[PDB]
Amino acid sequence: TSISRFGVNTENEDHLAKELEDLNKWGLNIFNVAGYSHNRPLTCIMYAIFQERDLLKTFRISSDTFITYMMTLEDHYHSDVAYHNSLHAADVAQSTHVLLSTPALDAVFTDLEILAAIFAAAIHDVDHPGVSNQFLINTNSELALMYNDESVLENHHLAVGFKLLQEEHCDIFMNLTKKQRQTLRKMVIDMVLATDMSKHMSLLADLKTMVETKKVTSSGVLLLDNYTDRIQVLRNMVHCADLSNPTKSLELYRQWTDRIMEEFFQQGDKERERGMEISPMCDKHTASVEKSQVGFIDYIVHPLWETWADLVQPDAQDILDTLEDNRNWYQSMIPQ
Ligand SMILES: [C]OC1=[C][C]=C([C]([C]C2=C(Cl)[C]=N([O])[C]=C2Cl)OC(=O)C2=[C][C]=C([C][N][C](C(=O)O[C]3[C]N4[C][C][C]3[C][C]4)C3=[C][C]=[C][C]=[C]3)S2)[C]=C1O[C]
Ligand SMILES: [Mg+2]
Ligand SMILES: [Zn+2]
Numbered sequence: 001t002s003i004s005r006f007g008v009n010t011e012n013e014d015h016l017a018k019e020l021e022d023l024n025k026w027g028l029n030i031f032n033v034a035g036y037s038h039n040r041p042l043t044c045i046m047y048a049i050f051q052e053r054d055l056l057k058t059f060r061i062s063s064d065t066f067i068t069y070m071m072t073l074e075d076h077y078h079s080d081v082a083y084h085n086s087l088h089a090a091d092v093a094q095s096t097h098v099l100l101s102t103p104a105l106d107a108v109f110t111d112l113e114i115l116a117a118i119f120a121a122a123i124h125d126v127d128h129p130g131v132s133n134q135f136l137i138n139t140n141s142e143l144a145l146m147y148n149d150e151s152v153l154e155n156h157h158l159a160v161g162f163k164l165l166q167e168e169h170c171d172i173f174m175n176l177t178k179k180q181r182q183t184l185r186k187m188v189i190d191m192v193l194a195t196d197m198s199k200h201m202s203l204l205a206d207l208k209t210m211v212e213t214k215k216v217t218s219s220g221v222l223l224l225d226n227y228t229d230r231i232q233v234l235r236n237m238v239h240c241a242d243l244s245n246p247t248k249s250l251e252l253y254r255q256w257t258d259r260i261m262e263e264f265f266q267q268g269d270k271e272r273e274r275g276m277e278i279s280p281m282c283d284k285h286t287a288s289v290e291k292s293q294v295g296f297i298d299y300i301v302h303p304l305w306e307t308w309a310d311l312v313q314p315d316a317q318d319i320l321d322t323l324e325d326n327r328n329w330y331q332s333m334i335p336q
Contacts (some may be wrong), residue, residue, distance in 0.1 A: 007038045007047035007067060010124035020048050026098055026248065026319065031255060041090035042077065046122055049097045055118075058111050060175035069170040073126060076160060081130035093121040095241040104312040106221045109230065112180055116187035117234050121241060123161030124192045128153060131267045132279065133196070139274070141328040151196045158192050158244045187231060194235040195242050204304055206239055207236045211310045223312070233311075240308050246293070246301050247323045293330045297323065 002010050010016045016036040022028040023045075034041035047067065050056050056066060078085035096117055100109065109117075129136075129143075133152045136144040147155045162185075165171050173181050194203060210232060215223040224230050245256040261281070268282030281292050305323055309316040 003067070004063065006037065007044035007070065008037045010036055010038065012036045016044070017124050020044075023048050023052055023094070024098060024101065026095070028098075029252065030087060030094060031252070033090070034087055039079075040071070040074055040086070042074045042086040042093065042122060043067065045090045045094050046070050046118070049093065049118060052097075053114065053118075055111070055115055059115060059173075065169055065172055065174070068167075069164065069172045070122070072164050072167055072170055073122060073161065076127050077125070077162065078128065078130065081128055082128055082266070083256070083259040084128035084130055084263065089122055089125055092124060092238070092241045092244070096121040097245045098239055099237045099241060102312050102315050102316050104216075104220070104222050105233070106219075108221055108224055109234070111185055112176075113187065113230065113234060115183045117191065117238060120188045120191040121182075121237055123188070124157055124195050124238065124242065125153075126157050127160045128157070130263050131270065134279065135175050135271070138276065140302055151193055151198070154196045158189055161188075161192075180187055187234070190231055191235045191238045194239055198240070200300060200304075203236050203239055203259070204307060206232050207304070207307045207311065211307060214311060224333050236304075236308065240304060243301050243304060246297050246326050247319045248304060248328060249322070250326055253326055257289060257293060261287070261292075288334070290330050290335075292328060292334045294334065297327045297330075302327065 002008065002013055006011070006016055006020075016033070019029060019032045019036060030041055031045055037044040047070065050061075050066065056063060057062070059300060074086045074089075077084075079085055090333075098115055099105075100117060133149075136152050137149050139161070143156055144152050146152075165173065173184065176184065193199070210229065217223050222233075224233060245253055245260075247253075248256075256301060264279075264282045265284040265287075268278045268284060271278045271282060281287050305316065305320055309320045
């Protein structure tokens with residue numbers, strides 16, 4: 001019954017429950033969730049989200065099918081990769097869950113859209129090996145061979161997430177109609193493929209056009225009256241969630257920074273041993289963590305969240321303010 005209540009075994013049910021009081025807040029601490037869930041933050045958080053949104057009831061998903069599926073998905077996240085592990089997946093899922101409740105996006109999305117977006121967040125980095133697409137391509141890896149060099153990892157994450165539905169008692173979409181399943185599959189593919197950084201400038205241009213053309217209901221919510229507008233918001237939302245580390249509390253952000261750099265430097269080490277050129281930010285002998293975080297925010301993270309903020313204005317004002325404070329803290333840490 002730790003299991004019926006939470007995703008998972010804990011023993012530390014009291015502390016776990018306490019952390020999960022922050023389920024609907026940007027300030028939830030996923031590192032604490034992992035510590036109190038026997039390191040199953042992704043199973044735990046997904047279960048809590050799904051109960052909070054009543055999705056198990058709406059889509060006739062038994063608890064046991066859900067947990068079996070989530071534990072399997074979670075087992076396919078590599079625990080020896082410093083950043084792209086199930087902690088990151090749990091964070092993006094939880095962050096997407098919070099974005100979906102933005103007041104300006106109230107009752108805009110259907111249940112199935114909500115299901116697709118959270119599922120997409122959960123699966124979006126599954127079986128990540130801890131190296132970039134470019135590394136896999138340049139080392140002639142099997143994955144790059146499978147996917148003809150194109151969004152290699154993102155294609156793989158989708159394939160794994162969807163293949164795992166076929167394991168015994170894992171079919172969480174068994175009681176959707178055929179058409180819901182087709183629709184959700186289309187949405188999920190769209191969202192996960194959108195997480196490829198090579199598409200970031202396209203997503204952002206489309207987001208800016210949504211801002212420039214936005215329409216507000218009498219009730220004060222955004223009017224999104226076709227599928228194209230809806231999926232475009234959703235894919236930008238999961239992209240935002242994926243790029244949300246610098247907008248959390250500084251104590252959280254710093255831990256995420258430490259892990260992404262540890263992962264980068266390990267790829268740099270493999271590049272160095274093979275005699276390759278070392279990818280940007282991957283050489284531990286020369287990289288500046290601080291310049292790199294401030295560059296990343298200035299060129300990628302702030303323009304995205306600023307545009308997100310303009311779309312739901314003023315509902316992301318506090319996220320934007322925290323990003324800007326964290327950016328200035330890292331800036332002030334640049335030597336000289
Ligand atoms: C926490 O933290 C973090 C977090 C997170 C992160 C992310 C993840 C991911 C991956 Cl991995 C992947 N995909 O697909 C997705 C995702 Cl989501 O990534 C990103 O996004 C990137 C990676 C890579 C790039 C591009 N390039 C860059 C550079 O290279 O850069 C240098 C130069 N210049 C000088 C120095 C440095 C800076 C500048 C850039 C460019 C331009 C600008 C900026 C950046 S993007 C990061 C981070 O950190 C960082
Ligand atoms: Mg990814
Ligand atoms: Zn990710």
